[PDB]
């Protein structure tokens, strides 16, 4: 509904991955803002936020909530489709995978840069399995809360985050993959 | 240093778990802001942000970076202390134990809101150390990191934090009473 809204539609999920896109959605977490606003917040120019808006209001993942005719020019306020949104990077698209690999790869980056030594190709794969594990079932819990949002009205977003983790944290304990493959990190990370 | 801080102080923890605090730091990861624009940002009152940053600046968290005369009023712009922050709930500090505590009972009434039927006492007790467990590994490798920052001055703060993740996750999965406590856990949340 409005409170949580899970995305698997490929497309919107890549667009709302661009670095500024996504300050701009947690911006909007706030209270509905404009352009010039979420620009001098973000250090960033007008007509480039202008197209991320765009781009994102073309998403689905912003809406003018209302305008204004501020002076000499007539602005729009814009806020989030919904208050959080869950994305799955693992389904099925070939191009997300790799962004997904592309991310677990940074990281693995800076592992090597602060002193851990281990064989990369394993410790992708063990981090890209897991990090499915965990999306899936995220996504599963979530899509169960979104249905139930009029039960949580009394809660805050970040409680209501906070809890689907825990539960989707529950869920993947019962996945013995999963285990082993938590269990194998403990041996290749150190 | 910058980057990262470790925050072990209760007194300093205490203020900055405030729900507006809270708020202010994340924006002002964003960039320094002054009382006013906060203000806007968050739809509070001038005077009560006043208060909350003065607290913040008081805690160490917060600190004047420059003034400015806007006009018939001279400003501080205000920037944190380091770009994130680490806290450990579990330094031995009765009251913080019984926030904790506070905090995963909130989730607990979501989950029994959700329809999730499970002996409360068991279950917070498993979700206490575990919590406990992750904030002194976490503690523990982002101490390690803020040593090494020199090291990581080529990342974004996102990349080092989901890092300080993994590297806390591997730490966790050597420990075998964690990974009992992450299998009743799975057993008790259905």
Not at 3 to 23: A, G, N, Y
Not at 34 to 42: C, K, N, V
Not at 118 to 127: A, D, G, T, V
Request: avoid cysteine; hydrophobic fraction near 35%.
């Amino acid at each position: 509904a409005k409170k949580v809204k899970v995305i698997t539609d490929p497309e919107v999920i890549k667009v709302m991955l661009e670095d500024t896109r996504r300050k701009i959605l947690k911006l909007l977490r706030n209270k509905e803002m404009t352009i010039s606003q979420l620009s001098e917040i973000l250090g960033k120019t007008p007509q480039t936020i202008y197209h991320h808006i765009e781009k994102l209001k073309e998403a689905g993942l912003v809406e003018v909530k209302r305008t204004e005719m501020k002076g000499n020019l007539v602005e729009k306020y814009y806020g989030r489709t919904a208050d959080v949104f869950y994305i799955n990077l693992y389904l099925g698209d070939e191009e997300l995978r790799y962004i997904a690999r592309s991310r677990l790869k940074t990281k693995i980056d800076i592992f090597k840069r602060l002193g851990y030594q281990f064989e990369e190709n394993e410790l992708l794969n063990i981090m890209d399995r897991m990090s499915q594990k965990e999306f899936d079932a995220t996504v599963r819990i979530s899509k169960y809360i979104e249905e139930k949002e009029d039960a949580l009205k009394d809660f805050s977003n970040e409680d209501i985050i906070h809890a689907i983790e825990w539960l989707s944290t529950a869920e993947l304990a019962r996945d013995e993959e999963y285990l082993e493959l938590l269990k194998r990190l403990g041996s290749i990370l150190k």
